[PDB]
Amino acid sequence: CPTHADSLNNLANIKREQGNIEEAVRLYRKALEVFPEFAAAHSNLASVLQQQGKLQEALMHYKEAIRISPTFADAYSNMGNTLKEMQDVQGALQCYTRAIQINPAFADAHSNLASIHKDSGNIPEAIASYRTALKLKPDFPDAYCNLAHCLQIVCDWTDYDERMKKLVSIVADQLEKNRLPSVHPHHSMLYPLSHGFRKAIAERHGNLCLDKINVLHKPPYEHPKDLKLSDGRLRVGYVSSDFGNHPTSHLMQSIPGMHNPDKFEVFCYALSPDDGTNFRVKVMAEANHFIDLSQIPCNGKAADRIHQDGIHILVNMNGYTKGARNELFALRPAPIQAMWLGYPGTSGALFMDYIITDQETSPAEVAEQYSEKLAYMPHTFFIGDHANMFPHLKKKAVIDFKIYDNRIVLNGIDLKAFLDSLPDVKIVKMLNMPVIPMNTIAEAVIEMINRGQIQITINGFSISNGLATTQINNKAATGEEVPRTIIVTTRSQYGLPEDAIVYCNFNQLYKIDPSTLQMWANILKRVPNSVLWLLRFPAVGEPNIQQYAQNMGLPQNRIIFSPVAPKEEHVRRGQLADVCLDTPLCNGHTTGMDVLWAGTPMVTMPGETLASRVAASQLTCLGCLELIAKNRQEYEDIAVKLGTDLEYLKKVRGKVWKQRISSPLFNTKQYTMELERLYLQMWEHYAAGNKPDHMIK
């Protein structure tokens, strides 16, 4: 009787919705025993197999369904999602467009197509396709929420207030109904969700990893209970997809080689293949052991490898980011597993014991935001490799085109040597700043900039246009090598005014909300002639920001946009700003380190989420408590005082310029030593037979 197969298939669909994936698989397969040419059952089975990480087996059943039913649009759209996950974008597009050609009214396929456009950087098409999906299927949480992030990306704040209301409403309903929330964990920081909801979002995405390891039927691992097998050394394993040209390496690439080999054995587990860059070379050369898990795609086999190395502390540097294999942590190959640096938030997951943070970022009163126990670094948990990557910015000189420290700037390894042969340079006391007068050399340098020349040679020294670094040395532009030439950086290169205060923010525009721009507008209105310097990130967000700024009483000529730049130029041109205005919604993280390395004071208002308090943690470690605001009034007042009291601005810029060297903020050696002391507190705690507890010293 046909109801037999149909009933098994429809019951399986219910079981899938309930989260009982195993039982759903069983019922789908029973349906195929009863009715072998059952197109729907082939496709529904492939769906749950995809959810279990059995991608090739899912593809096979999708094709079977389509062989049985060539116009089965559900199967084409579902297959597209599997191909997208396998990184076959053209295959995914071919499937989605086939499904929509079969059924133009197929809401889900329009939304899945939109997700390709969103990931490709084609935000207008993504918005169009998400809007078609919501028109066809008005109750559609994935489409609504991913549309909302599209609008965040381009700073479209049309009906932003009702958007946040409905986002929160959708999450509440999904959490109450035991469904996976349609807001992603890495985005939950951006919306006015409760801390409970953000933690629950995290836990649910973590649960996805369990469905993919449960099919491995692996028993629990036996873990080391001492250090005898490792010669008294603690074995630390750093797991990351980002050993390569990625901001995480720009932060911590020095740390594996700075560990003390008398008490630590360092294993780096790469989740990505070798991208050929010096970042990957350095970690592969300096770690005691380097293991390319990108060659071991089975998470059961990869976890076995970790466990065979005898790791004591395994460090999750991905969290919920591209390239993560949190399945590895779900299998628990190590007795202690910690979140660190790469992901600004909680995993919400039982399989992570600790998050490495600090008392400024994560004060004890807000411990309930995290599923992990808190493990404190003594100053800030943030770190950057700037002192190793960008030593040419330790010193600077200027040209007195008339004296400013940030209108025409020179940096270089050989800059001092160059200046030794210019007898008319003046040394200004502010740690000392040399000042080139408006002489023959200065005119040639300024002429190079105005004509867009690439570089000139003066007294045997190469002098480079700071806009042309990729034509001179591509490896210098990326931060893989220290630039060799003397580089010239000027406000004229970016259209910034020579006679006014520059406030900057170099973050992606999705970190800005209406509340932030209003606060920036309040500041500019109180500092005459000052401008705000932002990035085209993306470009299509520029007219939205200009329009909202103008509605707040700010003419368009008050906001200047530049393009996104290679890493080294992005850090170097921070020297042209007077002040950085941090985004309170989600602070600059890497970019906070970047701007302070240039000596630019950063004003910040720490919030409640981890992502909203990082900049203040950085400024506390730096030693500039006067840059940290307790509320919006203080944030504006601090920024206006810096833009109007020029003696105070010189004082505060002088602090940053000096303390980036003398404070712990950029000191990777001290960081690694304190990191080691924290690892040993963790290990001893476990070795005494205790479950994880807070390590706040």
């Binding site: 197969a5 149909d6 298939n9 429809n10 669909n13 899938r16 919705e17 059952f38 729907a40 059952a41 496709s43 529904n44 769906s47 995809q50 959810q51 089965f72 559900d74 199967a75 759209s77 579902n78 597209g80 999602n81 997208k84 996950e85 889900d108 396929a109 939304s111 899945n112 997700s115 969103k118 990931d119 559609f140 994935d142 489409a143 991913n146 349609s182 992603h184 890495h186 919920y320 980011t321 591209k322 993560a324």
Partner: peptide, 14 residues
């Protein structure tokens, strides 16, 4: 930046 999630469609047998 992570890949945007997608929506699988469940087919009802009739």
């Amino acid at each position: 930046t992570h890949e945007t999630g997608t929506t699988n469609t469940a087919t009802t047998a009739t």
